[model samples]
Target chain A: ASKRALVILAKGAEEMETVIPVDVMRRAGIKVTVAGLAGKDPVQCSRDVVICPDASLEDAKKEGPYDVVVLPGGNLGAQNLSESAAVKEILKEQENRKGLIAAICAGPTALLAHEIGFGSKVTTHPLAKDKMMNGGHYTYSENRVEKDGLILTSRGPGTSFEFALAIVEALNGKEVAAQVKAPLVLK
Target chain B: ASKRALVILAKGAEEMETVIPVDVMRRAGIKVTVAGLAGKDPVQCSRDVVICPDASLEDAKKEGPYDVVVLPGGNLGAQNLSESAAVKEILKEQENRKGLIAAICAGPTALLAHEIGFGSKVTTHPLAKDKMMNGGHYTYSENRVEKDGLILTSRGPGTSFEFALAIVEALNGKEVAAQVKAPLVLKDLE
Candidate 1:
C-alpha cells in the first residue's frame, strides 16, 4: 500500500512552500491531498499565486487517517491554521495515533498553537523563532530540516525540498527519497 | 521603476519551474503577470497542480513590452510552447528589441523551436540535451544557470532559484537580487 500525505492549504500560505512539497511528494508516489482550509475554493498565497486544492478540509477529513499531515507557512496562513478548531482536532488525533506531522517556515508555529509535539526539538523560519518559542515548549534548532520523533519541521522556502524529502524518507525510505531527489537537480 | 515580467503559463508546465520564478521575481518587487497560454483559465501543470493565471496571453500582450519573458519547462509544456504562434511572436519581439528572455529545463527547446536565440550559449535539463541540440543552433553549457547576452537559461527545478535570481539581477541589479536572496535562505548553488 502507498503512503498518503495531507497538505493543509490556507489562504496567504507561502506558495513555494506549498507547491514544492505537493509536487515532490507526488513524484515520490505518495497519495497526496491538497486540502483547502476555507472550503474547496482556490486559495490566494502570500505572493498572490492562487492554488486550487483537491478537496475541502471537511471532505478530506472524511478520507483521512493520512500517514502524514503537512502545513506550509506564511504569517497569515499559519495564523489561520493556528485558529482553526478543525486543525487542532486533526493534529491532536494525528499525535494520539502516532502519525507523522510536518510543517515548514511559520508552519511550526501552528504546531505550537495546536499544542502538538510540545517538547520536540524543532525549527521554523528564523523570523518565526520568537513565536515558536513563546513558552519555550520546544527546544529550537538551526538545522535546515528537523525531525523529532514524528514531528518534522523545516525553516523556509529554500528548505522545502529537504523538508519534503524528509517526509518521504519517514513514510517511504531513504532510497525512495534519494531516487526522487535526483531529478530535482538539488545541490 | 519596478520591472515587469510576463510568465507564459501553459498546460503541463512544471509547477516548480513556473512557480519559483513567479514567486521569486515578485519578491524582488517585479510586477509579474502569470499569463495563461491556452487562454484565461486555470492551467494543469505537469504534476497535476492547478495554477490560476492572472490573464490570457492575448490580453497580457496588450500590456507588454515587459522587462523579461520567462518560460518554465516540462516536456509537454515545452511542446505546447513550441507549437504556439503567439509564443513565437513574443520571443521574436523580445529578441528583436534586446529585452531579456529566460527559459529553463526543456524551456530552451521552445526558444530553439522558435529560432529566437541561435548562437547564444545555453543549457537545459540533461534529458533535454538531444532535443535542444538537434540542429546545433545554440552551444550548450553544463552550468547550473547559463546566461549568454539577452538569452538566459538554467537546468531543472533545482536551478530555479539561481535562474530567478539571475533574472532579478538582470532587471533590478546586484543589490536588489542580493537583498531578495537573503530571505530565501538559499544554499550554495555550486
Candidate 2:
C-alpha cells in the first residue's frame, strides 16, 4: 500500500510553508492528500494562497487510518484548527495509533489546545514561543527539527526542508530521507 | 519628517511576509512606500495578493536615498531583486550610507550578489545557506534576528516580527523596539 500523509488546510494557512512541504514530499515520492476541514474544494491559505483539497475531514474520517497528520501553521489557520473538533479528534487518533503528528511555526500552537505538549519538547516560530509554551514546561531547540515521541515540530520556513526530511524519516526510513536530503544538499 | 520604509514588490513575493510588516509598522506609525519594479502600477504577490505601490523603483531611485530598503522572500522575488540593477544600486547606496538593508528568507540571497557578507556574519532562510555560504561565511542562527552592522537578516516568515522589530530599532531606538517587543513578551538575546 502507498503510504498516506494527511495535510490539514484550514483558513489562513501559510501558503509557502504549507505548500512547499507538500511539494517537497510529493517530489520525494510521498503521496500527500490535502485534507480540509470543509468540503473538498479550495481552501485559502494566509495572504490569499488558495489550495485545492483532495479530501475533506469528514471524508478522511471515513477512510482514514492515515500514517501521518500534518498541520501547516498560520495565525488564523492555527486558530481554526484548534477550534475544529474534527481536527482535534484526528490528532487524538493519530496519537492513539502512534502515527506521526507534525506541525511547524504557529501550527504547533494548536497542539497546546489539545495538551499534546504536556511532556513533549516543542519549538515553533520564534514569535510564537510564548503561546506555544502555554505555561507548560518544554525545552526549546534552535535546531530546525524537534522530535519528541511521535510529535515532530520545526521552527519556521527556514527549517521546512529539515522538517520535511524529519517527516520522511519518521514515515519512511532514515536512508530514504537522507536520499531526499542529499539531492537538495540540505544537510 | 515621517520615516519612509521601502518595500520591494515583485512576482512571487510572500504576500504575508511583505504586507504584515507594512501593516504592522504603519499601525505603529511608520510610513511605507511600495516600490514596484516591474511597472508603474500595482504588483501581485504570491497567492494573488495585489499591492499597489506608492512609487516605482525608477521614481524612488530618482527620489534619492531611503532610510531603509526591505525585501520579501519567495523563490522568484528574491531572484528578481538580485538581478535588478536599480535595486542593486539602492543596496550599494544603503551600504555606503550605512543605512538599514533588510531581507528575510530567500530575500537574503540578494545580499550575496551585493557582496554584503564579505566580512560580516549573516543568516538566511536555512535552505539557502549552501548558496549563501558559497559566496561568504555566515553563522547559522535559528534565532529570528541576525545583525551584522546595518545589514539585518532574518530566517523566514516565522521571523517576520523579529525582522520588523530590528527595523524599528534601527529607525527609531532600542526603547521603541522594546515597547514593541513587550506586548509579544519575546525572550531577548540568548
Candidate 3:
C-alpha cells in the first residue's frame, strides 16, 4: 500500500519548497494530496508561481490521518499557516496521532505558532530563526535537514531536495529515498 | 535598465526546472515572463503541479526580444516545444540576435529540433543525451552546468539552481549572481 502525504498550500508559499517535495514524493510513489489552505483555488507563491491545489484543506482533513503533513515556507505563507484556527486544529490532531509533520524554510515557524511539537531540535531559514525561537520553546539546529522523531525540518530553498528526500526516507525508508535521490543529481 | 527573461512554459514541463529559474531570476530582479506554449492557460507540469503562466506564448513573444529565452524540460514538454512552429521561430530569432538561450534537463533537446546554436557545447539530463545528440548536431559535455558563448545548459532538477545562477551571471554579472546565490544555500558552483 502507498503511504499518503498532505501538503497544505497557502498564499505566498515558496514555489520551490512546495514543488520540490510534492514532485519528489510522487516519485517515491506516495499517494500525495496538495490541499489549498484558504480554499480550493489557485494559490500564489512567494515567487508568484501560481499553483492549483488538488483539493481544499477543509475537505482533505476528513480523509486524513495521513502519514505525513507537509508545510512549505515563505514568510507570508508561514504567517497564514500560523494564523489559521483550522490549521491549529489539524496540527493538534496530527500531533496526537504522532504523524510526521515536515516543514521547510519559514514553514517550521508555523510549528512554533501552533505549539505542535515542542522541544524537538529543528531548523528553519536563518532569517526566521528568531521568530521560531520565541519563548525558547524548541532548540534550533543549523543542519540543513533536522529530524527529531516525527517532526522533520529544513532550512531554505537550496535545501529543499535534501528536506524532501528526508521525508521519503522517513515514510518509506533509506533505500527508497536513495533510489529517488539518484536522478535528482543532488550533492 | 534591468534584464528580462522569457521562460516558455508547456504542459508536462519539469516543475522544478521551470520554477527554479523563474524564482531565482526574480530574486536577481530580472523581469521574468512565464509564457504558456499551448495558450494562456494553467500548465500541468510533469509532476502534476499546475502552474499558471504569466501570459500566452503568442502574447509574451510580442513583449520579447528579451535578454534571455528559457526552456525547461520534461520528456513530453520538450517534445511539445520541439513540435511547436512558434518555438522554432522564437529560438531562430533569439539566435539571429545573438541573445542568450538557456535550457535545462531535456530542454536542450528543443534546440536540436530548431537547429539553433548547433556546434556549441552543451549538456542535458543524462537520459536526454541520445535525443539531444541526434543527427550529430552538437558537442555534448558532462559538466553539471555548461556554457559555450551565449548558449547555456544544465542537467536535471539537481542542476536547476546552478543553471539559474549561470543565467543570472550572464545577464546581471557575477556580483549579482553571488548575492542571489548566498540566500539559496546552494553547494557553491564556482
Candidate 4:
C-alpha cells in the first residue's frame, strides 16, 4: 500500500501549522490528504486564511487506515478538531494501532482532550502549557521539536521548520528527514 | 482625521500573526489597510495560505501619512517587508512623527533594518533575539507585549492576543484596551 498521512483541518485551523507540514511532507514524497471536518468546502483558518481540503473527515475515514494523523493548532482550530466525531474516530483509530498522532501548539489539546496522551510526554505553545499539562507531562523547550513516540509537537510559529523535520522523520525515515534538514541546516 | 494603520502582507507571513492583529485592531475600531509590496495581488503565507490585500504598497504611498505602520512576521514576511521601499518610507514617517510602529515575531527585523531602534529597548521573537539585538539592546521578555515609545512588539503567534491589545492601547487608550480584553479575559502586565 502507498504510505499515506491524514491532516485534519477544521474551520479556524492555524494555516501555517497545517500547511507547512503538508508542504514539507509532500516534498518528502509522502501522500498527504488534507481532511476537512466540515465537508467539502474550504475552511477558514483562525486569521481568515482559507484552506480547501483534499477530502472531508467523512470521506477520509473510508480512505484510511492512515499511517499518521496530524493536527495543527490554532485557538479555534483545536476546538473544532476536538469536537468533531469524525476526528474523534481518527484519534481512536490512531490509539488502537498505537500509530503516530502529531499535533503542534494548541493542536496537542485535541489529542489531550481525547485522552491520547494519558502518559505521553508532550509540549505545545507556552501559553497552552497549562491545558496541555492537564492530560500529560509538559516540557518547556525551544529545541525546535519534541517527539514522544508517534506523538510529535513543537512550540510556536518559529518552530515550523523543525516540526516539519520531525514529521518527515516519522513518516519517511531518518535518512529522508536528514536530507530535508541538511539544506535548511536544521540538524 | 480618521486614523489609519498600514498592515504589510507578504510571502511567508504567519497567518495568525497577520490576521489576528488585523482582526483585533479593526474590532477595536481602527481602520486597517492591507498593503502588499509592489502590486502583488495575493500574498502567500509560509504554509501556502493566501491573503489578498486591499491595496498595493505603491498605492499606499500615494495615499500617504498613515497613522501607524504594522508588520506581522513569519520568516519570509519579515525579509520581504524589510526590503520594501514603501514600507521603508512609512517606517521613516512613523519615526519622524513618533507614531506607532508595531511588529511581531520576525517583523521586528524590519524595524531594525529601518534603523528605527538605534537606542530603543526592543523585543522580538526569541529566536531572532540576536538579530534584533544587533540593531539595539534586546530585552528578553516572557511578557506577551512590550512598548518603547511609540513602537510596540510581541514575541510571536502565541502573543497575538497580547500584541493586538498593545495596538488597542496605542490607538485608543488603556481603558478601551481593557474593555476589549474583558470578554477574552486578557490581562495586561507591565
Top-scoring candidate (lDDT): 1
What TM-score against the true fold does each predicted structure earn? 0.99, 0.53, 0.98, 0.58
Summarize candidate 4's per-residue lDDT along B71-138 as a digit string, tens digits: 98888989988887767877887789878888998999888887775666677777777888873455
Work out the iRMS of candidate 2: 8.4
Evaluated on the second chain alone, the candidates' TM-scores are 0.98, 0.88, 0.98, 0.90
Off by over 4 Å in 1: B188-190
Judged by DockQ cut-offs, is candidate 4 incorrect, acceptable, medium or high?
A: incorrect
**Positional deviation of residue A93's Cα in model 3 after best superposition, in angstroms:** 0.8
Native-referenced Cα lDDT, model 4:
0.75
| DockQ-based CAPRI category assigned to the predicted complex of candidate 1 | high
Residue-level lDDT of model 1, residues B72-164, one tens digit each, is: 999899999999999999999999999999999999999999998899999999999999999889998999999999999999998999999
Candidate 2 docks with a DockQ of 0.05
Alpha-carbon error at A155 in model 4, in Å? 19
Candidate 3 lDDT over residue span A150-181, tens digit each: 99999999999999999999999999999999
Task: Give TM-score, chain B, model 2.
Answer: 0.88
lDDT of 4 by residue, A135-165 (tens): 3454444444778777777765446666776
Q: What is the lDDT of residue A28 in candidate 3?
A: 98
Reference-based lDDT, each prediction: 0.95, 0.74, 0.93, 0.75
C-alpha DockQ for predicted model 1: 0.86
Across A22-69, the per-residue lDDT of candidate 1 in tens digits comes to 999999999999999999999999999999999999999999789999
- Candidate 4 chain B lowest-lDDT run of ten: B181-190
TM-score of 2: 0.53
